[PDB]
């Protein structure tokens, strides 16, 4: 879900299941056809990517009854690692067309430590890689479109792999009609009642 989009703080709050796949030949095993779904506490004993979100204002991983993580080892050494994250992410908004605007928020994903010489990111499944966009319950906005990006972004310390997820929002005009424009139109209409009161009624027309 996207819990809320706020203009007063130029941000939005997002909750998701974040999944990662990589191959670590050191974990390859034989003699067991099964996928080893081990207790999540194994993750503290393994190497895992340093992925972080560039524009998060803060984030936390849910923890009740266990830290919400998944580890699943495949015989060929492939590791599936996933965890449930709630993030509050920055989203600069162009309010110049406020009631009829169309904002563009994004989530940018990058490796903190390893450069392109050490890690590469890709969307597993291409455009299929993100789901749940159908179940956004925003009252103020509606998801017109989403699409996914992948690129290398370069700093002084090196070139880093990056993925980014983007949402195009169109605002629901309904609320602002009822609570800004109906009052404005009605008060403007009521003001013309002065032209129907007789001119001699100074107190009434002024009041």
């Amino acid at each position, epitope marked *: 879900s996207i819990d809320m989009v706020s203009e007063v703080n130029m941000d939005y709050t997002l909750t998701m299941y974040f999944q990662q796949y990589w191959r670590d030949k050191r974990l390859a095993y034989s003699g067991i056809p099964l996928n080893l779904t081990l207790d999540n506490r194994v993750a503290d004993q393994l190497w895992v990517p340093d992925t972080y979100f560039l524009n998060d204002k803060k984030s936390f991983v849910h923890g009740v009854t266990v830290k919400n993580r998944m580890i699943r080892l495949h015989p060929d050494g492939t590791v599936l690692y996933g965890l449930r994250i709630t993030t509050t992410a920055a989203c600069m908004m162009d309010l110049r067309r406020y009631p009829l605007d169309e904002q563009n928020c994004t989530l940018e994903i990058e490796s903190y430590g390893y450069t392109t010489d050490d890690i590469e990111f890709y969307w597993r499944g291409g455009d299929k890689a993100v789901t749940g966009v159908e179940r956004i319950e925003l009252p103020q906005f509606s998801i017109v479109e989403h699409r996914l990006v992948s690129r290398n*972004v*370069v700093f002084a310390t090196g070139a880093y792999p990056r993925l980014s997820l983007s949402f195009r929002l169109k605002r629901n005009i309904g609320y602002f009609i009822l609570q800004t424009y109906m009052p404005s139109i009605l008060i403007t209409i009521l003001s013309w009642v002065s032209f129907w009161i007789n001119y001699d009624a100074s107190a009434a027309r002024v009041a």
Partner: nanobody, 108 residues
Framework: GSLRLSCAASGHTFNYPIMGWFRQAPGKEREFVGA????????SYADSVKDRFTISRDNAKNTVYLEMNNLKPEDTAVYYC??????????????????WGQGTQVTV
């Protein structure tokens, strides 16, 4: 000598708040020159052109200008006007700039 370069932009520039200028002389890599922020006005320069060139902008016209003032023979090159996204990396690296201009020439 002295000279003026003009660059015009259109579209949803709010997503790409920072403009930049680049150049390359024949047979050389693309050098950084300078950058300008839309609606912020902040600027940064390459030291080879510091205090010789200045970059300015017009929000209503959606144009950015670079003053080719106090030109030197080493400045002969095709100059590219370019734009950069909000969350791309360093300003000094052309790989971070997405949309690019024609590459107008300057000579002396």
């Amino acid at each position: 000598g002295s000279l003026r370069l003009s660059c015009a932009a259109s579209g949803h520039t709010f997503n790409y708040p920072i403009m930049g200028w680049f150049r390359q002389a024949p047979g050389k890599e693309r050098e950084f020159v300078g950058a300008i922020s839309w609606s912020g006005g902040s600027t940064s320069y390459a030291d080879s052109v510091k205090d010789r060139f200045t970059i300015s902008r017009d929000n209503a016209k959606n144009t950015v200008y670079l003053e080719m003032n106090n030109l030197k023979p080493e400045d002969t090159a095709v100059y590219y006007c370019a734009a950069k996204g909000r969350y791309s990396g360093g300003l000094y690296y052309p790989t971070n700039y997405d949309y690019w201009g024609q590459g107008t020439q300057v000579t002396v």
